[PDB]
Amino acid sequence: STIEERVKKIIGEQLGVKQEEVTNNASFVEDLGADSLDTVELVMALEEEFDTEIPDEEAEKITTVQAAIDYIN
Amino acid sequence: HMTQFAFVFPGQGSQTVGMLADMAASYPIVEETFAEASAALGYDLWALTQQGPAEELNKTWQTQPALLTASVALYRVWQQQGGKAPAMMAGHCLGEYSALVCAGVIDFADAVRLVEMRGKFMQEAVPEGTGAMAAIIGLDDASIAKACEEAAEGQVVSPVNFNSPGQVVIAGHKEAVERAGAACKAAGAKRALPLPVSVPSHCALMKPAADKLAVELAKITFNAPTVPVVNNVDVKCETNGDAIRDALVRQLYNPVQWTKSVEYMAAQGVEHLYEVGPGKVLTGLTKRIVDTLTASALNEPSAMAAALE
Numbered sequence: 001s002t003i004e005e006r007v008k009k010i011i012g013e014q015l016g017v018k019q020e021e022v023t024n025n026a027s028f029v030e031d032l033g034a035d036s037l038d039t040v041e042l043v044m045a046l047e048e049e050f051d052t053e054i055p056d057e058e059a060e061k062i063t064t065v066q067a068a069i070d071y072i073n
Numbered sequence: 074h075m076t077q078f079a080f081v082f083p084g085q086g087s088q089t090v091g092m093l094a095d096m097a098a099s100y101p102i103v104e105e106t107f108a109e110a111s112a113a114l115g116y117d118l119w120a121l122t123q124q125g126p127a128e129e130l131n132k133t134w135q136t137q138p139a140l141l142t143a144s145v146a147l148y149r150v151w152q153q154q155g156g157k158a159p160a161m162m163a164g165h166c167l168g169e170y171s172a173l174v175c176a177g178v179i180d181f182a183d184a185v186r187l188v189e190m191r192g193k194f195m196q197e198a199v200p201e202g203t204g205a206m207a208a209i210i211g212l213d214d215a216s217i218a219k220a221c222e223e224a225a226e227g228q229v230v231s232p233v234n235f236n237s238p239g240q241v242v243i244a245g246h247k248e249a250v251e252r253a254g255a256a257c258k259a260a261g262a263k264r265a266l267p268l269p270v271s272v273p274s275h276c277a278l279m280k281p282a283a284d285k286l287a288v289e290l291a292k293i294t295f296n297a298p299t300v301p302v303v304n305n306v307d308v309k310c311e312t313n314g315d316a317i318r319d320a321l322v323r324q325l326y327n328p329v330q331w332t333k334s335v336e337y338m339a340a341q342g343v344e345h346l347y348e349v350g351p352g353k354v355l356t357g358l359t360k361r362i363v364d365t366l367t368a369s370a371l372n373e374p375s376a377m378a379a380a381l382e
């Protein structure tokens with residue numbers, strides 16, 4: 001399990017979605033069906049697994065699977 | 074002619090200071106549309122939307138013409154760049170007025186004046202600081218109705234917006250809304266979220282406001298719609314002027330059936346909802362209502378370009 005695989009699993013867990021649907025280019029709202037409450041929870045859950053603290057100025061830029069992968073690096 | 078789409082229009086709560094700033098910078102028709110609204114209202118509506126403060130943008134008799142004008146400006150960008158008309162339209166609360174303008178039912182300047190008055194009647198019926206609306210997330214409809222009945226305490230509070238499975242908005246007196254939200258959370262609700270609206274729309278407190286709105290709507294010409302519009306109160310596509318007027322009157326103090334409205338569009342063969350207004354509220358609801366629907370917003374220039382291609 002690498003960083004990208006762990007980011008993908010969490011997104012699938014939080015959004016209730018199959019792993020094959022969590023593609024690198026999917027956006028949370030328009031593709032995976034998230035609303036704005038689900039995205040705030042998804043960011044929190046990313047801070048939990050990777051022990052980072054995402055400042056909410058740049059949490060608001062994390063709108064796609066790849067944006068989250070790239071932030072965690 | 075491949076994918077059938079509808080246009081949906083958001084209501085109060087979706088406004089923000091600076092909304093549509095990128096679209097206006099790309100498309101001069103945005104600010105030309107606001108200049109028409111501004112002339113009807115007597116003040117510069119574009120400046121209010123761009124400079125605020127949010128305290129002014131959030132006062133309902135200014136909120137409502139700001140949102141209506143934003144939605145009509147986005148529809149005019151779409152059409153100006155050659156976009157074709159949607160298969161049908163549905164407006165969420167105040168958005169029903171925006172849909173009726175875009176369908177050709179009500180003249181734009183008439184509508185601008187109309188929703189300013191609607192906000193004034195609503196504020197008159199429930200003064201500033203005395204009402205509230207709250208979104209109860211993840212709780213069954215039997216429990217919310219029970220929480221509301223027990224929290225009334227001689228005041229008004231009831232479910233008014235069926236927004237999706239797992240989202241019902243309640244509204245009434247401020248203190249009653251707080252007691253109902255606390256009891257909802259105590260009964261297993263995930264959140265009880267207060268909303269940025271200055272009046273409690275669609276509850277019984279608005280009934281006297283609806284009586285005055287009926288008289289104002291009688292003074293306005295209604296035309297037959299050129300695109301079907303699904304109304305909030307009955308989930309019906311009315312065409313006659315008297316039917317449309319009556320549904321707007323009743324909308325002010327009866328529940329908004331947004332879940333059933335989106336189900337109906339899907340049943341008619343709509344495959345994609347475009348949200349024609351600021352924010353992404355209606356987009357975030359769509360898949361929780363019908364899992365096979367897709368949705369996106371048309372309030373940024375890049376999204377507009379991609380949808381037109």
Ligand SMILES: *CC(=O)NCCNC(=O)CCNC(=O)[C@H](O)C(C)(C)COP(*)(=O)O
Nearest residue numbers: 035036084085086165166208234242354357
């Ligand atoms: C039409 C109307 O009555 N408007 C005033 C009441 N507001 C609503 O009915 C919508 C309430 N729901 C929301 O605003 C969003 O769904 C959430 C819960 C705030 C999440 O927002 P996010 O997806 O931007």
